[PDB]
């Protein structure tokens, strides 16, 4: 994010995660209903995401080795 | 008459329609389908239509006399479209007629005696257009403007970009 | 790659007017030319491109009301015969294209009216009373909003109809003098 | 009976302001109509409503073109030289009040005249791209603009868009043509 | 069907009109200028929508100035 | 029953024997009728060599005028006298007028059916079905023993070519009230018929 | 004499005539008013405090609130412009020194503004264009032990809920992932974290 209306300049990291979804045709009617989404993240949210996912991964590994 | 004759006709029609009993739709001839249902009712839609004009001024007449210009009623596939478009075309033509040569009343035909073609009317609508254009001329400086701020735009070009990133960086998950 | 009509050279001089005039008819509101009439000369995925190019070129030329020469010069590198066909096509039915363009201007809005139909009836009797005799006008509307046609219905008696006619005549007193 | 018209002014101006709120500003929730009747007991037994009709008539009459106050006095006197007409001092008082709420009245009329989505604010952003999942190096910049659109009396919608250099230049050219057309049509 | 360039939307065409409102039921001399815009936009599905809105002169000049500033900022870096 | 200037000029031209003979007049009238009626028409309506001697502009202007006149007459349910009087005011003879009247009479019924098939309407019901049950118990109620009626209406919407069905549940008292209402409607119809 | 760097938005004598009215008021009220400005900025959820505090001033000296509001409006212009441009302390200091509007007032005002400037600057970052922000997330990791057509199976799965701010409203996105897809997602997020801290 180099610049914006309310600030002339900066240099801030930003993320744009895009994903694809397939829903069962029955649950939406007669349509295939395949949608795409986009979420714009920041540093703290990404860090929390990664910490939680790493915690889950460590749990899985411990279960595997136990 | 009509206030009673209309009632008599309505009563006769109701009696005749009551005479026919009810039949399942699967065994319905088109007449009954009209009577005991509305399955075969189409909507009203009008499509733009072009007609030849009795004006032989030149080049366009070549198109008007060519097979490229199909006959007016057959310019659309469906007959309902044909009838609807023709009816609307006639109504619009008559409306344009109403604002044109019309043998009207003792006073409405008064202007028709000496009216130039859309010229004598221009003097008293030029006043309205004067108000329109003078209202437009305002607000281009009345408020907010002047907006002359040629300081934020081009100065950035001189300085350019000073800093930049280096080598790919990474770390160990916490 | 030059004028957008460059893709039109593949079509011979004989089958030009049909394609062009049927395209103009499609623009005005009628049907468009079909693939199975000129399929040998183009591919569908590029037939659509040439169709759009012709339509948009004609719309721009008519809207901006260019002079004769500038329209002539843009078509310099076309076929020796297609140029006069194009110019005669512009000269013939410019007014229809202008009318279609003006109609499309009204498309700049939330919704537009497409067409309507009205039915008149005589209400005779109801559960409340058996001496009603109430004339009622039913007005049906087909108004296009967003990208769909939405039907509507209105039921009016003599008083509401008179008030509506009065208001519309008040508006028409302005419309007529605005021309 | 000759109550209030030649005697009390406070109820009259209160009714004028309440009508302005009720018909122009779109706040009909609680008005003085229900309080003045039981707090001011001067309700005529028989002729009480028709004078409110003249109130409404005069209120709508001045709302046509908003002329200069020099020409409003003449019409006010002409309409009000008859029975129960307003006074010269009261004519000046009401003429002043129009200035007190002229711009608000005009804006509410235009606001209560809209037919399509209106612009309720522009917020944008310009960014510099770095890389993606497969691409490892990118520098081409983009611009993000979000539009606040909404028809009067309805929840606002938001629209987001993307851009690059060429499309931004094209849009700037189109807006410049719009400005030129605005400029040339004054004369 | 996966491209980074298109994320949310990308307008394909831009049309506008200039006109002024002359009269209304509640006011016979409304007479203020306005400018309208029509946007047809395409999403990831490949469809085309149609969004239209109306503006005033001050809002339009603010719009133009903001786009000018955006052009400058994007050009510089 | 108003008419426009262009239609008047077209019908003025139609009378001239030099422009049209009896055969050309009949062919033009029949072509106009076919264009108005048939749903599989084409330019072939004017591809009849007998008509290949006059300018197409006048030909098609008069074709449109004739179609408009037929449409207006059908809409206003005109009869012999009105058509005859207007055509006489158009400087016709007793031959062209007779042929026009005969052509109108030949396929009047189809034109009357066509213009009556335009428009929308509220959903039209077609039949009913009913199921009789005897309620016994619910989860929080263990002894009721009350008959109940199930009803299902079959309706078709002119707006959507489908047959949606409306379902509702009635008791004996509600069913009696409904039957009484319908019987009152029937008696009102009979009263209208008697008058 | 060239342009003036104090003002970006032109301030003709019509609006710049009232800039001297702050001089009459005293220092105690000046400090109280500035602290009140900051506190009102922090808590817009309770605006009743503004009327409650101005009630005393209205009753005591009958000071017309319009003038106070006008002076407050005009005085906030410079710091707001600084926020939108992120001015350096020297720039604001030099502007105030050159213009010199009750420097006794201005030194304290600028000092207190700079002491609290960074939080105000940070608050502006949130108020910008963020397309479908992510606010909250939840997950559930479990094992399947059967289904309608298979009696026994140990298919692992992961479920996610994403609380995405779809404009002024809120939307929840529910997803399911398999084991390889989850592992690839985690690796891709690690890569994104590596690439997101390159510049700074």
Short mmCIF file of C-alpha atoms in Angstrom, two decimals, chain D:
data_model
loop_
_atom_site.label_atom_id
_atom_site.label_comp_id
_atom_site.label_asym_id
_atom_site.label_seq_id
_atom_site.Cartn_x
_atom_site.Cartn_y
_atom_site.Cartn_z
CA UNK D 1 -63.53 33.38 15.44
CA UNK D 2 -60.70 35.94 15.34
CA UNK D 3 -58.38 34.03 17.66
CA UNK D 4 -54.64 33.77 17.09
CA UNK D 5 -54.50 35.37 13.64
CA UNK D 6 -54.42 38.94 14.98
CA UNK D 7 -53.40 37.98 18.54
CA UNK D 8 -50.97 35.08 18.95
CA UNK D 9 -47.94 34.75 16.70
CA UNK D 10 -46.14 31.93 18.49
CA UNK D 11 -48.67 29.23 17.45
CA UNK D 12 -48.58 30.45 13.84
CA UNK D 13 -44.80 30.32 13.43
CA UNK D 14 -44.73 27.04 15.33
CA UNK D 15 -47.21 25.58 12.85
CA UNK D 16 -45.16 26.92 9.93
CA UNK D 17 -41.97 25.29 11.23
CA UNK D 18 -43.82 22.05 12.04
CA UNK D 19 -45.19 21.95 8.49
CA UNK D 20 -41.70 22.60 7.11
CA UNK D 21 -40.43 19.64 9.13
CA UNK D 22 -43.39 17.44 8.15
CA UNK D 23 -43.46 18.06 4.38
CA UNK D 24 -39.86 19.00 3.43
CA UNK D 25 -37.41 17.48 5.92
CA UNK D 26 -38.99 14.03 6.21
CA UNK D 27 -39.34 13.93 10.01
CA UNK D 28 -43.05 13.23 10.58
CA UNK D 29 -42.49 11.16 13.74
CA UNK D 30 -43.59 13.64 16.42
CA UNK D 31 -44.91 17.07 15.46
CA UNK D 32 -46.53 19.96 17.32
CA UNK D 33 -49.94 19.13 15.81
CA UNK D 34 -50.90 16.89 18.74
CA UNK D 35 -49.52 19.22 21.45
CA UNK D 36 -50.81 22.68 20.45
CA UNK D 37 -54.43 21.52 20.38
CA UNK D 38 -54.49 20.58 24.08
CA UNK D 39 -51.90 23.17 25.20
CA UNK D 40 -53.42 26.04 23.20
CA UNK D 41 -57.21 25.62 23.66
CA UNK D 42 -58.12 28.23 21.01
CA UNK D 43 -59.35 25.57 18.54
CA UNK D 44 -62.41 27.05 16.78
CA UNK D 45 -65.45 24.79 17.30
CA UNK D 46 -66.32 24.71 13.58
CA UNK D 47 -63.79 26.46 11.29
CA UNK D 48 -60.38 25.13 12.28
CA UNK D 49 -59.03 23.03 9.39
CA UNK D 50 -59.63 25.27 6.34
CA UNK D 51 -57.13 27.89 7.52
CA UNK D 52 -54.49 25.15 7.61
CA UNK D 53 -55.31 24.61 3.93
CA UNK D 54 -54.40 28.24 3.24
CA UNK D 55 -51.26 27.68 5.31
CA UNK D 56 -50.36 24.82 2.97
CA UNK D 57 -51.26 26.86 -0.10
CA UNK D 58 -48.99 29.76 0.84
CA UNK D 59 -46.22 27.34 1.83
CA UNK D 60 -46.31 25.65 -1.58
CA UNK D 61 -46.79 28.93 -3.47
CA UNK D 62 -43.41 30.38 -2.49
CA UNK D 63 -41.74 26.99 -3.09
CA UNK D 64 -41.93 27.39 -6.89
CA UNK D 65 -38.94 29.51 -7.96
CA UNK D 66 -37.56 31.14 -4.78
CA UNK D 67 -37.56 34.67 -6.17
CA UNK D 68 -35.71 37.65 -4.74
CA UNK D 69 -37.29 38.97 -1.56
CA UNK D 70 -38.13 42.23 -3.35
CA UNK D 71 -40.67 40.34 -5.47
CA UNK D 72 -41.94 38.08 -2.67
CA UNK D 73 -43.42 41.01 -0.74
CA UNK D 74 -45.65 41.98 -3.67
CA UNK D 75 -47.12 38.49 -4.02
CA UNK D 76 -47.50 38.10 -0.26
CA UNK D 77 -49.45 41.37 -0.09
CA UNK D 78 -51.55 40.48 -3.14
CA UNK D 79 -52.54 37.09 -1.72
CA UNK D 80 -52.88 38.44 1.83
CA UNK D 81 -54.69 41.75 1.31
CA UNK D 82 -58.00 39.92 1.86
CA UNK D 83 -59.76 38.79 5.03
CA UNK D 84 -57.48 37.19 7.60
CA UNK D 85 -54.39 38.18 5.64
CA UNK D 86 -50.96 38.42 7.21
CA UNK D 87 -49.66 41.71 8.57
CA UNK D 88 -46.81 43.76 7.14
CA UNK D 89 -44.66 42.92 10.17
CA UNK D 90 -45.71 39.28 9.92
CA UNK D 91 -45.06 39.40 6.17
CA UNK D 92 -41.50 40.52 6.93
CA UNK D 93 -41.22 37.82 9.61
CA UNK D 94 -42.21 35.03 7.23
CA UNK D 95 -40.07 36.49 4.43
CA UNK D 96 -37.09 36.28 6.79
CA UNK D 97 -37.92 32.68 7.71
CA UNK D 98 -37.55 31.63 4.07
CA UNK D 99 -33.91 32.71 4.22
CA UNK D 100 -33.59 30.78 7.50
CA UNK D 101 -34.43 27.50 5.72
CA UNK D 102 -33.97 28.14 1.98
CA UNK D 103 -30.93 25.97 1.23
CA UNK D 104 -32.21 23.15 3.44
CA UNK D 105 -35.58 23.22 1.67
CA UNK D 106 -33.96 23.13 -1.77
CA UNK D 107 -31.63 20.28 -0.81
CA UNK D 108 -34.47 18.23 0.68
CA UNK D 109 -36.51 18.82 -2.48
CA UNK D 110 -33.62 17.63 -4.67
CA UNK D 111 -32.96 14.81 -2.20
CA UNK D 112 -36.69 14.00 -2.29
CA UNK D 113 -36.52 13.98 -6.08
CA UNK D 114 -33.84 11.36 -6.82
CA UNK D 115 -34.55 8.41 -9.09
CA UNK D 116 -31.24 6.51 -9.45
CA UNK D 117 -28.32 5.53 -7.26
CA UNK D 118 -26.42 8.56 -6.03
CA UNK D 119 -22.77 9.01 -5.14
CA UNK D 120 -22.33 9.13 -1.35
CA UNK D 121 -18.53 9.31 -1.19
CA UNK D 122 -15.41 8.08 -2.98
CA UNK D 123 -12.55 6.23 -1.30
CA UNK D 124 -9.57 4.92 -3.26
CA UNK D 125 -6.10 3.41 -2.87
CA UNK D 126 -3.03 2.95 -5.08
CA UNK D 127 -0.70 0.00 -4.48
CA UNK D 128 2.48 -1.60 -5.77
CA UNK D 129 2.43 -5.31 -6.58
CA UNK D 130 5.31 -7.56 -5.52
CA UNK D 131 4.68 -11.22 -6.44
CA UNK D 132 2.15 -14.06 -6.37
CA UNK D 133 1.99 -17.84 -5.97
CA UNK D 134 3.76 -18.62 -9.26
CA UNK D 135 5.16 -15.25 -10.34
CA UNK D 136 8.24 -14.33 -8.31
CA UNK D 137 8.85 -10.70 -9.34
CA UNK D 138 6.37 -7.97 -10.29
CA UNK D 139 6.39 -4.17 -10.08
CA UNK D 140 3.41 -2.99 -12.15
CA UNK D 141 1.21 -0.79 -9.92
CA UNK D 142 -2.58 -0.78 -9.60
CA UNK D 143 -5.32 1.42 -8.16
CA UNK D 144 -8.29 0.43 -6.00
CA UNK D 145 -11.44 2.57 -5.82
CA UNK D 146 -14.58 1.81 -3.82
CA UNK D 147 -17.86 3.60 -4.57
CA UNK D 148 -20.52 4.46 -1.98
CA UNK D 149 -23.78 4.17 -3.92
CA UNK D 150 -27.32 4.18 -2.57
CA UNK D 151 -30.80 5.42 -3.38
CA UNK D 152 -32.35 7.80 -0.87
CA UNK D 153 -33.89 6.04 2.11
CA UNK D 154 -32.15 2.72 1.43
CA UNK D 155 -29.03 0.93 2.61
CA UNK D 156 -25.88 1.87 0.71
CA UNK D 157 -24.08 -0.56 -1.60
CA UNK D 158 -20.34 -0.75 -2.25
CA UNK D 159 -18.52 -1.40 -5.53
CA UNK D 160 -14.82 -2.23 -5.88
CA UNK D 161 -12.71 -1.94 -9.03
CA UNK D 162 -9.18 -2.56 -10.29
CA UNK D 163 -7.04 -0.52 -12.66
CA UNK D 164 -3.64 -0.09 -14.29
CA UNK D 165 -1.92 2.74 -16.15
CA UNK D 166 -3.69 2.40 -19.51
CA UNK D 167 -7.23 2.15 -18.15
CA UNK D 168 -6.64 5.04 -15.74
CA UNK D 169 -5.45 7.15 -18.67
CA UNK D 170 -8.53 6.20 -20.70
CA UNK D 171 -10.87 7.11 -17.83
CA UNK D 172 -9.04 10.41 -17.35
CA UNK D 173 -9.48 11.17 -21.05
CA UNK D 174 -13.20 10.40 -20.89
CA UNK D 175 -13.64 12.65 -17.85
CA UNK D 176 -11.69 15.38 -19.67
CA UNK D 177 -14.10 15.09 -22.59
CA UNK D 178 -16.97 15.37 -20.10
CA UNK D 179 -15.41 18.56 -18.73
CA UNK D 180 -14.91 19.99 -22.22
CA UNK D 181 -18.54 19.28 -23.11
CA UNK D 182 -19.58 21.02 -19.89
CA UNK D 183 -17.45 24.02 -20.83
CA UNK D 184 -18.57 24.47 -24.45
CA UNK D 185 -22.32 24.34 -23.75
CA UNK D 186 -22.47 27.59 -21.74
CA UNK D 187 -22.25 29.60 -24.98
#
